[PDB]
Design an enzyme around this catalytic site. Structure first.
Site, short mmCIF file in Angstrom:
data_model
loop_
_atom_site.label_atom_id
_atom_site.label_comp_id
_atom_site.label_asym_id
_atom_site.label_seq_id
_atom_site.Cartn_x
_atom_site.Cartn_y
_atom_site.Cartn_z
N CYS A 7 30.67 30.94 55.59
CA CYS A 7 30.65 30.40 56.95
C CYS A 7 29.77 31.18 57.92
CB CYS A 7 32.07 30.33 57.52
SG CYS A 7 32.11 29.75 59.24
N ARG A 50 31.19 32.51 61.80
CA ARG A 50 32.25 33.51 61.90
C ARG A 50 32.32 34.42 63.11
NH1 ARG A 50 32.23 36.57 56.41
NH2 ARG A 50 30.32 35.38 55.97
N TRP A 106 32.88 23.40 65.08
CA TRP A 106 31.91 22.44 65.56
C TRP A 106 30.68 22.46 64.68
CZ3 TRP A 106 33.71 26.33 68.97
CH2 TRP A 106 32.84 27.42 69.19
N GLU A 139 23.76 20.44 59.36
CA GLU A 139 24.75 19.82 58.49
C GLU A 139 24.54 18.31 58.52
OE1 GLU A 139 28.35 22.73 60.31
OE2 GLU A 139 28.81 21.12 58.89
C1 HEM Z 1 33.43 27.41 65.28
C2 HEM Z 1 32.41 26.72 64.61
C3 HEM Z 1 32.06 26.81 63.24
C4 HEM Z 1 30.80 26.65 62.78
C5 HEM Z 1 29.56 26.35 63.64
C6 HEM Z 1 30.86 26.76 61.33
C7 HEM Z 1 29.80 26.51 60.49
C8 HEM Z 1 29.80 26.44 59.12
C9 HEM Z 1 28.71 25.87 58.32
C10 HEM Z 1 27.34 25.34 58.79
C11 HEM Z 1 29.17 25.78 57.07
C12 HEM Z 1 28.49 25.01 55.96
C13 HEM Z 1 29.32 23.83 55.47
C14 HEM Z 1 28.62 23.07 54.37
O1 HEM Z 1 27.40 23.28 54.21
O2 HEM Z 1 29.28 22.26 53.68
C15 HEM Z 1 30.50 26.37 57.06
C16 HEM Z 1 31.29 26.64 55.94
C17 HEM Z 1 32.62 27.10 56.01
N1 HEM Z 1 33.28 27.43 57.19
FE1 HEM Z 1 32.67 27.53 58.95
N2 HEM Z 1 32.14 27.02 60.89
C18 HEM Z 1 32.91 26.97 62.02
C19 HEM Z 1 34.31 26.93 61.98
C20 HEM Z 1 35.15 27.11 60.89
C21 HEM Z 1 36.63 27.23 60.96
C22 HEM Z 1 37.50 26.78 62.13
C23 HEM Z 1 37.05 27.71 59.76
C24 HEM Z 1 38.33 28.07 59.38
C25 HEM Z 1 39.25 28.74 60.17
C26 HEM Z 1 35.80 27.77 58.93
C27 HEM Z 1 35.70 27.97 57.57
C28 HEM Z 1 34.58 27.79 56.76
C29 HEM Z 1 34.67 27.75 55.31
C30 HEM Z 1 35.84 28.17 54.41
C31 HEM Z 1 33.49 27.28 54.87
C32 HEM Z 1 33.21 26.95 53.42
C33 HEM Z 1 33.48 25.49 53.13
C34 HEM Z 1 33.22 25.14 51.70
O3 HEM Z 1 32.93 26.06 50.91
O4 HEM Z 1 33.30 23.94 51.35
N3 HEM Z 1 34.70 27.42 59.65
N4 HEM Z 1 30.88 26.71 58.34
#
Ligand code: HEM
Ligand code: HEM
Ligand SMILES: C[C@H](O)[C@H](O)[C@H]1CNc2nc(N)[nH]c(=O)c2N1
Ligand SMILES: C[C@H](O)[C@H](O)[C@H]1CNc2nc(N)[nH]c(=O)c2N1
Ligand SMILES: [Zn+2]
Lengths: 417, 417
Positions: A116, A119, A288, A293
Site C-alpha cells: 500500500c 500508508r 481513496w 488505479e
Molecule cells: C487513504 C488512502 C489510501 C490510498 C490512496 C491507498 C492506495 C493503495 C493503492 C494504489 C493500492 C494498489 C491497489 C491495487 O493495485 O489493486 C493499495 C493497496 C493496498 N492498500 Fe492501500 N490505500 C489507502 C487506504 C487503505 C486502507 C484504508 C487500508 C486498510 C486499513 C489499505 C490497505 C491496503 C492493502 C492491504 C493493499 C493491498 C491490496 C491487495 O493486495 O489486493 N489501504 N493501496
C-alpha cells in the site's frame, strides 16, 4: 549486508538502515536461491482452521507488542491480560480482543501492508466494530454506514469495518464481493463483453441468486453477504449512497461522449485481517483512489474495460504500429480526465506523483521512528510513468509483519447447501 | 508451491511450470523472511581474488553443463577435457577456455541475464576473442572494431569482446568507462550541470588524466583503458565510428530546437563475465537500444539530463500542480521523438511494446525447451506505461544461473602508482 540491511535511493543517494526486518514473523516465499518478489499470491489440513493450542503463542506475540507500543511491557496490566487471555482460550478455544487492541491491531495491519502506497495515513483509520453482528441483513446495515461515513459526500475518510472472527462451528462471515462497490460484467455469446470483464463470474453468481441484472455498462453490483456461515444473501446498495463521477476532459470536449464514469469509493472486501491470531474473514476497508488505479488499470487493462482502442480512433491516433506510441498517448489523456473529473466534482483523489512523494516521506519517518518500513516495490511503483515518480528509484525491503491483511480463497468455490 | 514453482500471467491466465530454478548455483540475496528483489547491488578476503583449489569445481560445473548441452555428457571427450583442465589448474593455477566453450559461455551468460528484456536474441551473439591482447593500445583497437562491427552503419548487431581473464600477478584488464560511448558531464560552480550528471566524476578523472575537454553538452568521453593492471590510458574514440542521431519530433517542429541528440550504440563495459570460474573483468558488450532507456531514463531522470522542465515550458504545459500530469505528457512526446528520429535515420531501435512482447515470446520458448527463464520483474518492466505492456502482468521467478555477468567495483577506487 553484514549485520543490518541498507536501502539506497539512486536519485538522491540517500541510504537508510533497516532494523525492523528482524521483526519478521511470516515468510516471504523467497529462498536464498529464488525470488518470488513478483508473485501475486505466494482453511487448513488438520482442523478446518487454526487450533486452540497454537492460538495463545500468537496472542502473546500481539499483546506483548501491544503493551510495548504503549510503553508498559512487563507491567501488571500486561501480565494480567496475558494470563486472562490464556484462560479464555483454554475455556472457549478462542478469545475476544478489547476495543483498544482491535483498533491498534487494524491500524498496524495497515501500517504493515507492504503493497500500500497510501500508508502515510495509517494512523487516521476509523475502526467500526461490527463484532456483535449476527446476520447478513445485519452486515448490510454495517456496510451501508461504512460507505456513507467513508464517502462523506466526496470528502473521503479512511475506515474499516470488522465483523465477527472465525471460529470452530458458528461458521464465518464473508463479503463475497472483491470490493464493496464494483460494476457488473456481461459476456454476450457474440464474444463481446459489456461492463467489467473482471466481474463476469461474480455477476453470473448474482444472477443465479436472483439478481435482476439491468444489463448496462456501469451497473453497480449487489452486495452478496455471508453471515455465520449461512448461504449468502443479495442486497442492493442504496444508489443514494454510491457517489459516482462522470468522466470528462479539461481540453477534449469529445471525451465526454465516451460515456465514461467511475465510483469514488474504493473498498477492498475480500481480504482477511489477522490480529493476535484471530482471523477476521470479513473486514471491508477503504481510503481513496490514486488516479492510476482507475485511469490505467480499470480502464486500460486488456482484461478490464480495455478502452484504449476505442479512445485511439477518437483521437485519430496513428494505429499502424505501436512505435507511434498511440497507446501511451491515449493513456495519459485518460488519466488527466479521471483526475480532472474527480477534482471538479470535489471527490477526493490523488495523482501518482503526490501519492508516491508522500509514500517516500512516510518511509523516512518510519525508518526514523520504527527503524524500517516493509514495502513491495512491484506494487508501490505506479502502473504508468514509473520512472518519473520518486519510488521507482527507491530500493525497498519487503517482509511480513503482524498484525496484517492476507488473501483468502473465494467462498463460492467451497460453499454448500 | 509444493514441488515445482509456477508462474501465472494475470492478463491471459496462462500458467507456466518452472523446473530450471533448481539449477540455481548463486544466491539471490533473499531469505525465507526478507525480499531484496528491488535492491540494485545485492577482490576477496583471503587472496586478492579466487583460488586455484576452488577453481576446478567451478570449471567442472561449466564443462559438465557444456558437454550436456551438446549431448555428450560422460563421453571420452568430456572426461578427457575434465582431466585436462584439472592438470592445467594444478600446474598454472588457472586454465584456458577453448574458443567454442568461450562462445557457449558468453551466449549463455546473456541467456541467463535475468535483467535483460532483449534476451530473445541471445543466440545470435558475435563473440570477439581478445584474449591475446596485452596492452591498452591493443584494447583500443579491439574496441574500435567492436563498435564498427556492432554499429554496422545503423543496422546494429549484437556483440561482446572478451579480454584476458583475471589472474594472480599480471594484474587485470578493465575498461574504466561504464559504457563504451557516453557523454561527459560538467558541473559549473554555478550549481548547474552541463552534460550528463551521471558522468561528472568520470569526466573529472579523464581531465586529471590529461583529457582536453571541449566543455560541450554532448561531448563523447574518451575511453580510459587498463591493461595487465597498469595505469589506465586515454583514447579518443574515432568520431567517424560513433554513430549519432539528432532528435526531432514527427509533429512538433519546435522539438528540434531543444538541440537534442543521442548515440545509437549502447555498450555496457564495466561488468564482469564469469565462465567455468574464470573471471573476465573486461568484456564490453552491446546490442541495441529500447527507446525508453533514452527517452525516459537518460533524458528525464532528475539525476540525468532532466529535460522535463525545459520540455514543459516549450509545450506551454500547465505546471501549477502535478495533477495536470504535465510531466507524463512531456514524457510521451520525448519518447515518440526518440523513436521517430532513430527510425528516420535508419538506426536500429525498439519501442517498449515490441520489446516486451518479444520477451514474453522468449519466456514461453524457454519454459518449453529449457524448463524456465530467470527474470527480474523490477528490471524487465519498462520505466513508463508499464501497465500496458505484457510483462507487467507476467509473474517472474528470479534466480542466478551460471555462466553470468556480474557487477564489480569501480577501479579508480583502488588503483595505485
Ligand atoms: C487513504 C488512502 C489510501 C490510498 C490512496 C491507498 C492506495 C493503495 C493503492 C494504489 C493500492 C494498489 C491497489 C491495487 O493495485 O489493486 C493499495 C493497496 C493496498 N492498500 Fe492501500 N490505500 C489507502 C487506504 C487503505 C486502507 C484504508 C487500508 C486498510 C486499513 C489499505 C490497505 C491496503 C492493502 C492491504 C493493499 C493491498 C491490496 C491487495 O493486495 O489486493 N489501504 N493501496
Ligand atoms: C540485442 C539487443 C538488446 C536489447 C534491446 C537489450 C535490452 C536491455 C535493456 C532495456 C536493459 C536495461 C538496461 C538499464 O536499464 O540500465 C538491459 C539490461 C541488460 N542486458 Fe540486455 N539488451 C540487448 C543486448 C544485450 C547483450 C548483447 C548482452 C550481453 C551479451 C546483454 C546483457 C544485459 C545485461 C547483463 C543487462 C543488465 C545490465 C546491468 O544490470 O547493469 N544485453 N538489456
Ligand atoms: C531502486 C530500484 O531497484 C532501481 O531504481 C531500478 C528499478 N528498475 C530498473 N529497471 C531497469 N531496466 N533499469 C534500472 O536502472 C532500474 N532501476
Ligand atoms: C505479475 C505481477 O505481480 C502483477 O501484474 C502485479 C504488478 N504490480 C502491481 N501493482 C499494483 N499496485 N497492483 C497490481 O495489481 C499489480 N499487479
Ligand atoms: Zn525476493
Amino acid at each position: 549486508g553484514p549485520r543490518f540491511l541498507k536501502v539506497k535511493n539512486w536519485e538522491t543517494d540517500v541510504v537508510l538502515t533497516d532494523t525492523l526486518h528482524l521483526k519478521s514473523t511470516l515468510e516471504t516465499g523467497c529462498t536464498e536461491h529464488i525470488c518470488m518478489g513478483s508473485i501475486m499470491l505466494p482453511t487448513r489440513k488438520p482442523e478446518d482452521v487454526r487450533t486452540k493450542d497454537q492460538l495463545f503463542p500468537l496472542a502473546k506475540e500481539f499483546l506483548d507488542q501491544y503493551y510495548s507500543s504503549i510503553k508498559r511491557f512487563g507491567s501488571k496490566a500486561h501480565m494480567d491480560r496475558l494470563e486472562e487471555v490464556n484462560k479464555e482460550i483454554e475455556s472457549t478455544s478462542t478469545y475476544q480482543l478489547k476495543d483498544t487492541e482491535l483498533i491498534y491491531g487494524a491500524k498496524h495491519a495497515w501500517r504493515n501492508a507492504s503493497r500500500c502506497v497510501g500508508r502515510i495515513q495509517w494512523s487516521k483509520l476509523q475502526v467500526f466494530d461490527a463484532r456483535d453482528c449476527t446476520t447478513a441483513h445485519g452486515m448490510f446495515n454495517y456496510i451501508c454506514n461504512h460507505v456513507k461515513y467513508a464517502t462523506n459526500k466526496g470528502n473521503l475518510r479512511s475506515a474499516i469495518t470488522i465483523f465477527p472472527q472465525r471460529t470452530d462451528g458458528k461458521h464465518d462471515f464473508r463479503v463475497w464481493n472483491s470490493q464493496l462497490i464494483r460494476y457488473a460484467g456481461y459476456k454476450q455469446p457474440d464474444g463481446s463483453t459489456l461492463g467489467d470483464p473482471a466481474n463476469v463470474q461474480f455477476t453470473e453468481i448474482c444472477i443465479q441468486q436472483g439478481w435482476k441484472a439491468p444489463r448496462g455498462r456501469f451497473d453497480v453490483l449487489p452486495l452478496l453477504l455471508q453471515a455465520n456461515g449461512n448461504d449468502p444473501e443479495l442486497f442492493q446498495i442504496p444508489p443514494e449512497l454510491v457517489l459516482e463521477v462522470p468522466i470528462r476532459h479539461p481540453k477534449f470536449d469529445w471525451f465526454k461522449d465516451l460515456g465514461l464514469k467511475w465510483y469514488g469509493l474504493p473498498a477492498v472486501s475480500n481480504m482477511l485481517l489477522e490480529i493476535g491470531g484471530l482471523e477476521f474473514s470479513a473486514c471491508p476497508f477503504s481510503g481513496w483512489y490514486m488516479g492510476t488505479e482507475i485511469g490505467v488499470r480499470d480502464y486500460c487493462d486488456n482484461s478490464r474495460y480495455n478502452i484504449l482502442e476505442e479512445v485511439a480512433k477518437k483521437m485519430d491516433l496513428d494505429m499502424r504500429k505501436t512505435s507511434s506510441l498511440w497507446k501511451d498517448q491515449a493513456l495519459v489523456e485518460i488519466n488527466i480526465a479521471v483526475l480532472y473529473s474527480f477534482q471538479s466534482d470535489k471527490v477526493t483523489i490523488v495523482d501518482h506523483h503526490s501519492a508516491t512523494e508522500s509514500f517516500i516521506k512516510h518511509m523516512e519517518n518510519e525508518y526514523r521512528c520504527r527503524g524500517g518500513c516493509p514495502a513491495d516495490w512491484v506494487w508501490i511503483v505506479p502502473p504508468m510513468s514509473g520512472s518519473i515518480t520518486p519510488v521507482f528509484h527507491q530500493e525497498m525491503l519487503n517482509y511480513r509483519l503482524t498484525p496484517s491483511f492476507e488473501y483468502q480463497p473465494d467462498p463460492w468455490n467451497t460453499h454448500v447447501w
